[PDB]
Design a protein around this ligand. Sequence first.
Ligand SMILES: *[C@@H]1O[C@H](CO)[C@@H](O[C@@H]2O[C@H](CO)[C@@H](O)[C@H](O)[C@H]2NC(C)=O)[C@H](O)[C@H]1NC(C)=O
Ligand SMILES: *[C@@H]1O[C@H](CO)[C@@H](O[C@@H]2O[C@H](CO)[C@@H](O)[C@H](O)[C@H]2NC(C)=O)[C@H](O)[C@H]1NC(C)=O
Ligand SMILES: *[C@@H]1O[C@H](CO)[C@@H](O[C@@H]2O[C@H](CO)[C@@H](O)[C@H](O)[C@H]2NC(C)=O)[C@H](O)[C@H]1NC(C)=O
Ligand SMILES: *[C@@H]1O[C@H](CO)[C@@H](O[C@@H]2O[C@H](CO)[C@@H](O)[C@H](O)[C@H]2NC(C)=O)[C@H](O)[C@H]1NC(C)=O
Ligand SMILES: *[C@@H]1O[C@H](CO)[C@@H](O[C@@H]2O[C@H](CO)[C@@H](O)[C@H](O)[C@H]2NC(C)=O)[C@H](O)[C@H]1NC(C)=O
Ligand SMILES: *[C@@H]1O[C@H](CO)[C@@H](O[C@@H]2O[C@H](CO)[C@@H](O)[C@H](O)[C@H]2NC(C)=O)[C@H](O)[C@H]1NC(C)=O
Ligand SMILES: *[C@@H]1O[C@H](CO)[C@@H](O[C@@H]2O[C@H](CO)[C@@H](O)[C@H](O)[C@H]2NC(C)=O)[C@H](O)[C@H]1NC(C)=O
Ligand SMILES: *[C@@H]1O[C@H](CO)[C@@H](O[C@@H]2O[C@H](CO)[C@@H](O)[C@H](O)[C@H]2NC(C)=O)[C@H](O)[C@H]1NC(C)=O
Ligand SMILES: *[C@@H]1O[C@H](CO)[C@@H](O)[C@H](O)[C@H]1NC(C)=O
Ligand SMILES: *[C@@H]1O[C@H](CO)[C@@H](O)[C@H](O)[C@H]1NC(C)=O
Ligand SMILES: *[C@@H]1O[C@H](CO)[C@@H](O)[C@H](O)[C@H]1NC(C)=O
Ligand SMILES: *[C@@H]1O[C@H](CO)[C@@H](O)[C@H](O)[C@H]1NC(C)=O
Ligand SMILES: *[C@@H]1O[C@H](CO)[C@@H](O)[C@H](O)[C@H]1NC(C)=O
Lengths: 48, 48, 410, 508, 49
Amino acid sequence: KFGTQERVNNSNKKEWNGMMGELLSGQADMIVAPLTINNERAQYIEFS
Amino acid sequence: SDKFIYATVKQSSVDIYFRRQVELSTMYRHMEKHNYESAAEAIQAVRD
Amino acid sequence: KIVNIGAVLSTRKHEQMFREAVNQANKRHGSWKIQLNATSVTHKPNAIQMALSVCEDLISSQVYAILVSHPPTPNDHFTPTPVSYTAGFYRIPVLGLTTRMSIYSDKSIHLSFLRTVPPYSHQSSVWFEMMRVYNWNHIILLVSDDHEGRAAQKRLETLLEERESKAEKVLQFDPGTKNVTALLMEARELEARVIILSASEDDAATVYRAAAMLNMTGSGYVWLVGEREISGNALRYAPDGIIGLQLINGKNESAHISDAVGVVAQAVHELLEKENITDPPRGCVGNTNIWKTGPLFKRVLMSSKYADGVTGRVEFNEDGDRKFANYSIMNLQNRKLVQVGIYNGTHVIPNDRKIIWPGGETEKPRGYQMSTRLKIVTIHQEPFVYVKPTMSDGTCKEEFTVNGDPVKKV
Amino acid sequence: PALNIAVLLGHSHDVTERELRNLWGPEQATGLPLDVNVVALLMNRTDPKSLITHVCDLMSGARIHGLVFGDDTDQEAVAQMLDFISSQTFIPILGIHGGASMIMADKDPTSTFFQFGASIQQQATVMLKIMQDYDWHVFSLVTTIFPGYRDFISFIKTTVDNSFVGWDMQNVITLDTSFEDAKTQVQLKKIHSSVILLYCSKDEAVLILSEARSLGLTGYDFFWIVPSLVSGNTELIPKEFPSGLISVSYDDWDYSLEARVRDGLGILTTAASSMLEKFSYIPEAKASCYGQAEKPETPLHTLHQFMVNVTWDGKDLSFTEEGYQVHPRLVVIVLNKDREWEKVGKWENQTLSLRHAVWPRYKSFSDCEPDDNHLSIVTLEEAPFVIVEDIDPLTETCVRNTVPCRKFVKINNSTNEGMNVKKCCKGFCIDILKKLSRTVKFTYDLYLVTNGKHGKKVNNVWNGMIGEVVYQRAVMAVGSLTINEERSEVVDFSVPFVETGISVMVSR
Amino acid sequence: GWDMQNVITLDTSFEDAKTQVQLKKIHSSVILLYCSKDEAVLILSEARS
Ligand SMILES: *[C@@H]1O[C@H](CO)[C@@H](O[C@@H]2O[C@H](CO)[C@@H](O)[C@H](O)[C@H]2NC(C)=O)[C@H](O)[C@H]1NC(C)=O
Ligand SMILES: *[C@@H]1O[C@H](CO)[C@@H](O[C@@H]2O[C@H](CO)[C@@H](O)[C@H](O)[C@H]2NC(C)=O)[C@H](O)[C@H]1NC(C)=O
Ligand SMILES: *[C@@H]1O[C@H](CO)[C@@H](O[C@@H]2O[C@H](CO)[C@@H](O)[C@H](O)[C@H]2NC(C)=O)[C@H](O)[C@H]1NC(C)=O
Ligand SMILES: *[C@@H]1O[C@H](CO)[C@@H](O[C@@H]2O[C@H](CO)[C@@H](O)[C@H](O)[C@H]2NC(C)=O)[C@H](O)[C@H]1NC(C)=O
Ligand SMILES: *[C@@H]1O[C@H](CO)[C@@H](O[C@@H]2O[C@H](CO)[C@@H](O)[C@H](O)[C@H]2NC(C)=O)[C@H](O)[C@H]1NC(C)=O
Ligand SMILES: *[C@@H]1O[C@H](CO)[C@@H](O[C@@H]2O[C@H](CO)[C@@H](O)[C@H](O)[C@H]2NC(C)=O)[C@H](O)[C@H]1NC(C)=O
Ligand SMILES: *[C@@H]1O[C@H](CO)[C@@H](O[C@@H]2O[C@H](CO)[C@@H](O)[C@H](O)[C@H]2NC(C)=O)[C@H](O)[C@H]1NC(C)=O
Ligand SMILES: *[C@@H]1O[C@H](CO)[C@@H](O[C@@H]2O[C@H](CO)[C@@H](O)[C@H](O)[C@H]2NC(C)=O)[C@H](O)[C@H]1NC(C)=O
Ligand SMILES: *[C@@H]1O[C@H](CO)[C@@H](O)[C@H](O)[C@H]1NC(C)=O
Ligand SMILES: *[C@@H]1O[C@H](CO)[C@@H](O)[C@H](O)[C@H]1NC(C)=O
Ligand SMILES: *[C@@H]1O[C@H](CO)[C@@H](O)[C@H](O)[C@H]1NC(C)=O
Ligand SMILES: *[C@@H]1O[C@H](CO)[C@@H](O)[C@H](O)[C@H]1NC(C)=O
Ligand SMILES: *[C@@H]1O[C@H](CO)[C@@H](O)[C@H](O)[C@H]1NC(C)=O
């Protein structure tokens, strides 16, 4: 999965998956992939 | 329509873009059930 | 006319000196209008014994405020908790002498509990001041899962909010855990090199031992800890170069007793000038009604500033805790602790002593070490990132483009 | 194995000891491996010395393995005292009513003390659910220096950060003191028409609401949400409390004290049954409070970890680590025009059900300006113009370019009553209505019609849009309403915006 | 092509419930005021607050 803010059914918490989940959780530090920039993704991470 | 089915990769940038658009919601409810796991599977499906 | 003040003290000589201080305060203010009668009781091993004795002796004596201190026994497991409940039943204000536990800082549990010493939670403020002096931005928190760790973490985060900065990670461990290696392994891969620890003595000793066995005490690492981490067994295993805090008169009893009795006498004198003053209830049994002017006495105490206090300018904040105390930043050198400066209410001033950072170097270490091993994540996209299985040799076969240049593979 | 439970009540309640003993006589094998011998006791009042002596006597004599405490007064301190007793006796103590039902922030880690109440976090969650259901996304936060405000603000910020609803939080105001003196009017004057979450004490709420009314912050479009702290005693209500003051509290009307005691006894019995199934035998209680026993006093097995998974006959009365009920019986009440607390909605099983689907306008005071810009609009579902669709499964609220609309749907034709389901209405006419609202600056409560169909005069009585408009049940009828001679005679019409005649549809 | 948002009359006192929501109704960047100096001071003070 590329990454999308999805509502987990339990406790109703927003969570990012894919590269977003890897990067935001500290498992990854930089994403070199065909990642499309948009308003939602720029709120939490920074794009060059 | 049922005969014409168009889809995209589940949990990707285009899904977010279609979900946010105000006039584009009507097709989104149709495409959310037909989303594929990755681009390769969609390419294979459209090939055959 | 006579105003009674109750005291629960550790030793008989402490009670005698408290009575002498009461007499001195009465002489200073003047006994012509009101005479301060002081009653005292020694601690007991059982908490239920305290709960019974406070009603049988202090409440039945119609006291206005109760001064509570820790017992001579080194045990410090919430000893003043019973009194703070019983006098909290009638909203009778309680002045804490040397109780640094921050569970009493929450007025929702303890309705009326004042203290002349700041709790362990306020120590974070001191560290924040260091943030402004040595220019440290990325830090690692090692708070515990009890109320103290949570309170310290919350206070530190609140103080960092105004700077629009946050700690890199907030590691949490259960109290009294023999193994903590996982947290230090997780912290090692992080870039922040400033470690802030606040726990019990045993947990601090365990963390220090783990860090010593995990190469966390080398050059480039700085440790900031509270008093509990540099007192007792935690001092034995403390790594060299650790910076700890100690209050000037934290363990002192006489100075705190004198200052507390002075401030309570001033508050009583100020309060009795008001109208329709209500006497405290007499005896726990047969009287379930709260004190009518008890909250008013609480605000009077919280709004009273002692002029010349021995421990310092006695002042209480909105949380009912001591404000603007003298903190002595005290550093471990050659398995010995020496003062490297003094911290006043708001700012940090150093001294002629030279700070020895962990690892033996004297130069001030940088806040973080730049990590040059970037963890790269990639998604399988055919036009951009071809992925191919490898052979048994660990690498896949090299190819060439139409121009003959080799293709680079990772 | 015989399990002894002591149940302490006060003389204020009419329940007698014999009734308390007969409460645990259902005789359907409530405890499969053990039998329960309930002992009851009544006390005058609550005070430290007598309470401690009574608890120690009950532990020493009756050898109770648990304790159910029911308080009659409103003294919060008793609750803390109870916790302390647990920390010194290891006997599970349950708070039932009164002061013992008041929730505390942090319990002692070694104290096995639980309460029948709702924490501040649950109250904030219920407030957020109320605001989301009525689509009051824009709101402010007014707090004081009262204890328990920092964690409340932190939880509110965490919830607003992690919710898909917009939740346009304007600002946070913390009035430390000098409410009427200075430094506070400037902060209170910058709040516009929105919902106010007020957190303080009752006597403090007195002054806060008085100053808010003095500043004109209590209009029809201002909704005040407050926790149980300022609600306090339901019997007494301050005169300055504005009508429409929505509050959340632990219910005291439907949930009687008898049910409270029965639920507490059932919780203790099921915890004992689970422990007997898992462990070997119920440990004997401590010999006495006094004597200074030389021991860690730490039991090998306790009931603290067995109360997390509790399931009584019909309800799920499980508890959390901090001791809060997982599914508290929370009720949302309002101060109606009669100056009395009236129950409106309920919150159980993480499901919030409200009696009023649409929030009725409440006259805050006798001198309040009359409602003029708020309108009730009828609208009928027409495929090109008005599309009605269910609530969005993702956001649990109406999506963009749609407006809320309550449809009066019955359970079936058999029953003569129904409920208003809040669906989302969109389309051409909905967009026109939104544009009219954006131009004329008026608010609307659009609701579907269920009486007629586009209007027809039968028995000299109009139904549908014409009937609703003529009978003063609505101010306008936005939809696919065709202009007609009789309709224009009965009610006034606006300028047509689309040419709609009659035509014939034929198969090609 | 002016943009006249509204006309507000402060008939009653300047510190009661009225004249506050009316003042809050102002969203334009320019305000045309007309009164005498004594109540002008009060109106400007309320607007500043
Ligand atoms: C003034 O203080 C003295 C000293 O504590 C009080 O005398 C004690 O009173 C209690 C309660 O009756 C007794 O249990 C103690 O034995 C007394 N101490 C001595 C040394 O006799 C006295 O009661 C106080 N007076 C008032 C009016 O509060
Ligand atoms: C605490 O737990 C950790 C993790 O389980 C232990 O770390 C292991 O240490 C051994 C050698 O001492 C290594 O071979 C393992 O690879 C380590 N585990 C991991 C996951 O890396 C640690 O030994 C434990 N502490 C004690 C005192 O036993
Ligand atoms: C901690 O650091 C010390 C010294 O930097 C390490 O000790 C050396 O480790 C290397 C690699 O294992 C050995 O080749 C040397 O012989 C060791 N020297 C001595 C004097 O012991 C130690 O291995 C490090 N420990 C960890 C867990 O990283
Ligand atoms: C607690 O602090 C007080 C005040 O500093 C100490 O009392 C002083 O003791 C010295 C030496 O005996 C005297 O010269 C001072 O005059 C005393 N001051 C006062 C105000 O009495 C006391 O010794 C300290 N206690 C401990 C245990 O260190
Ligand atoms: C330690 O605390 C004492 C309080 O006893 C401080 O002494 C006061 O310092 C201020 C500032 O110069 C003076 O105005 C007061 O007259 C001093 N005495 C008292 C009784 O307040 C002392 O400065 C503190 N040490 C520091 C800040 O390093
Ligand atoms: C704590 O110490 C700092 C450093 O000495 C004090 O800050 C100085 O205060 C003096 C007196 O007003 C000023 O002239 C200096 O300009 C201040 N310097 C700085 C860097 O702030 C501070 O006042 C002390 N606080 C207390 C409560 O004594
Ligand atoms: C809570 O208790 C219930 C009832 O005892 C447990 O439900 C049973 O769990 C066992 C073991 O997992 C299953 O074999 C049964 O089939 C379950 N019964 C039913 C009706 O579902 C439940 O697992 C317990 N939960 C926890 C977390 O302990
Ligand atoms: C308690 O709440 C849960 C969660 O809402 C309920 O489980 C739902 O039950 C309905 C009715 O059958 C289903 O349509 C949902 O799919 C269920 N959701 C989940 C997550 O399980 C449960 O029924 C409630 N228990 C009651 C009301 O007794
Ligand atoms: C609910 O969430 C859990 C955790 O992500 C997941 O394993 C499960 O499949 C989800 N179930 C549904 C119905 O979404
Ligand atoms: C008691 O005194 C206070 C302080 O002056 C005053 O506000 C209050 O009204 C008085 N109450 C009575 C009953 O006289
Ligand atoms: C309190 O209860 C006791 C019984 O234990 C009774 O003797 C006494 O009269 C009661 N007090 C009052 C004021 O009724
Ligand atoms: C619905 O109920 C009414 C009476 O309430 C009845 O006249 C009508 O025939 C019913 N419609 C059905 C059964 O379709
Ligand atoms: C429920 O509604 C259906 C459809 O209108 C009807 O056929 C049925 O009789 C109703 N059930 C009753 C009236 O009990």
